[PDB]
Each structure stands twice: as C-alpha cells, then as structure tokens.
C-alpha cells in the first residue's frame, strides 16, 4: 500500500515547466483520501469515473504535480490551447485518467511575492504530450543572434508568477495533480480493496 499522501501532502510542489512525476505500482490504490482532501476547487475526470476508478485495476499510476495560476487550471485538459498547454504541460486527446486542482494561497503566496514558481513563455514549437523542457536557453526572437546575451529581442524563456496573498482568485496559486492510469497488456498491479 503506497498512498497518495507523500505527493499531495508535499511541503513544496514543482514549477509547471519542471513538473514532478512519480510512478506508482504494486500497491492497493484507494481514493477515499481524495474525497477527504481540501475543498477541491476542481476535480474532473476523463475516461474513468469518480466511482469507477476505485474498482478496476491498472498496471501503473503516473502522478504529475505542479503549481499554476487559477486562470490556467482550465488549460489542464485534453484538446486545449494556451501557454501552459503549448509550452509547459500538454495532455493528450486520448488521455485516460483525471485532474485535481485546489487553491493553495496559504502555502505558495508570500508578502512581497513568491518568485519560486516559474513558467515557460517562449518556445518555437508546441510540446508533445507528457513532454518536459527544463532547459534555460536565451530565446532568439529575431534575426540577430544572442550568443548568451539577453539584449533586446533575446530573452530568458522562464518567468516567475507573482503569487501574492492579496491577488485575485484568477491569479492565486493552485496546486494541480494529474493521474494517468495505464492498463496495458501486462498484468495489472494497482487496484483498490
């Protein structure tokens, strides 16, 4: 029995551009803890159903955790467009599994701003599903080469969120956990009691 507390009850989450990923296998996967958790600003599920995932067995459970703004919570969904979906975290259209998001203004907001959470604003191409791009290279937005000098149209591709306690609900920090369930032809291991 490996629960979901070590990821949900985390002291510090990860930035969306460097989202954390934990594998889970060879355990009994309960989901009453998910109901017992926070007011749960968002709890939506694609493919699986809230009362169905407790029964069927899965070969693997992939848990992706990060922190985003309340405006972009709707961007964590299959077939969606936006900065987060294009350059930070892309969910496939065939995604099976589901998404939990909850407000964390208490933890991830500090007076004067909490600049520990970053997102990627510039990228030439769209991310593939479940891709990671943690490189920090100066973004060449024009013909003139940068050569590591961030001058004029040459920018650092990562920008920090504000995350101040007084911000509106749209810009307040929200913690997001995405569960992907894999039930491949290999014998299943992770199922409920």
């Amino acid at each position, epitope marked *: 029995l490996c629960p979901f507390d070590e990821v949900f009850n985390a*002291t510090r989450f990860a930035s969306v551009y460097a989202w954390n990923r934990k594998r889970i296998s060879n355990c009994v996967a309960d989901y009453s803890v998910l109901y017992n958790f926070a007011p749960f600003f968002a709890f939506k599920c694609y493919g699986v159903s809230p009362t169905k995932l407790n029964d069927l067995c899965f070969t693997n459970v992939y848990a992706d955790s990060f922190v985003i703004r309340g405006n972009e919570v709707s961007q964590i969904a299959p077939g969606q467009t936006g900065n987060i979906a294009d350059y930070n975290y892309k969910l496939p259209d065939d995604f099976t599994g589901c998404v939990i998001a909850w*407000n964390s*203004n*208490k933890l991830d907001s*500090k*007076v*004067g*701003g909490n600049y520990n959470y970053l997102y990627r604003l510039f990228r030439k191409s769209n991310l593939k599903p479940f891709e990671r791009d943690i490189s920090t290279e100066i973004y060449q937005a024009g013909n003139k080469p940068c050569n590591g000098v961030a001058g004029f149209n040459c920018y650092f591709p990562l920008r920090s969120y504000g995350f101040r*306690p007084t911000y509106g609900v749209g810009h307040q920090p929200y913690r997001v956990v995405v569960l992907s369930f894999e039930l491949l032809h290999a014998p299943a291991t992770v199922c409920g009691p």
Partner: antibody
Amino acid sequence: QITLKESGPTLVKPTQTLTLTCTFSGFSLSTSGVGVAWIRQPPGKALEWLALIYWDNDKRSSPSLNNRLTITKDTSKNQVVLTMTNMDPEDTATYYCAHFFSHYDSSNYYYGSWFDPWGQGTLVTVSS
Amino acid sequence: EIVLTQSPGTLSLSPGERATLSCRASQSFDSRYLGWYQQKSGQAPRLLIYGASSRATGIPDRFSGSGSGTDFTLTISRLEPEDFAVYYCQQFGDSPFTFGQGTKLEIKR
C-alpha cells in the same frame, strides 16, 4: 502566548561582525505562514525592518543592507541567527526579533498579516 | 520603495477627547497590507491593528482603523492615560517592508 529572547555580544567594534541569536518559545519554525523577522530601532528614530526568514528557508532582506546581512534558522533548537558584517559606528540601535504570521479563514482570503509579539530588545552599540 | 508619511508629528490631547492619526503612502497597495503598532515609553512595539481594519486579539474596542487607496487612518476614542504612546503605520505591500516615522501622543495640560 509566545516569547522571544535575543542574546549575543551587545558590543561590537567598527568593521566587525555581530551575531545575534533569537531563541523563541511558544511556536516552531515549521508551521505554515510562520516567520521570524529581525528589526532595528535607532535611538530616537523610527523602526527599520532588517530581515525576515520563513518556515521553508525562504528569506527576504532589506535591499540597502542585502550585501552584509545573513540570517539563518535552527528549527531543532528554535533559534534564529542574524549576522551583520562591516559595522559602521551609526548602527547603534535596539534590535528586536518578532514572530510573523498571517490570517486566513477557510477560503485563503488573507485578512492581512502582522508582526506577532516582539522581543525584549537588545541594545547594540558600535565604537572604536 | 514605498514611503509612509504620518500626521500629525505630535498630537497633544488630554484623556477623554478623540484621537486621529493619518498615514499616507507614496504608492497605492491593497489596504490589507497596512497595520498599526503601538510602542510605549521604554518598551517594545506591539501589534495593534492588522489589515488596516482588523483589531488584534486583546486590543480594546476603542481602537479602529479605516483606509483605502493611499490614505489610512487610526481612530481612538477613550484614550485613557495608559493609552499614551507612539504609534507606527507599517506596510507589507512591496519589499522592503517599511514603518512610518511615528506619531507621539502627548498629554494636553
């Protein structure tokens, strides 16, 4: 009810380094939103915030004093150590360590924050 | 850097009348970032009001605070003789966090 006591060398020579230790009881530097802030008040002058350390090791310092300020925390022994280097002979003041906290209510709305009760106050003078 | 200016510099009144203190900010921040602290003679400052309108625990109901934009005020009504001290307005909007220059409450006679 929480308490904070500041100790250390109350007399420091010019261009030396002072190390003030704040021992705090009644709270732990491991809760959510808890911080410890070092503030100084020159004699006859207004208060001046120096530094603030958080529960998750995040630290803020005054930009005009960032270079020569270093504040560290010891959670097991409930201590905050403030180190100030290259002291000029105007830095004589009274230093307080204070608890920092905020107020939410069931929806993360942040009805403000404050400096929870201050320390007794340690008089530090600089003279050659 | 946000600069806080208090008024008046000194306020001399006897117990019984009303006391009003004003704090103006050089910039505009949310009203929930401002607080009022009291410091007696030969003592340390203590929290009086946080969020510019929320009285601290144990603070008598005579103290009130109200403000918006770049202007805030602290109002005392039954300022009994032990209520004579120095009052500071402090902001939490932008680093560094700064206090006002203070307002001394003297006894009229």
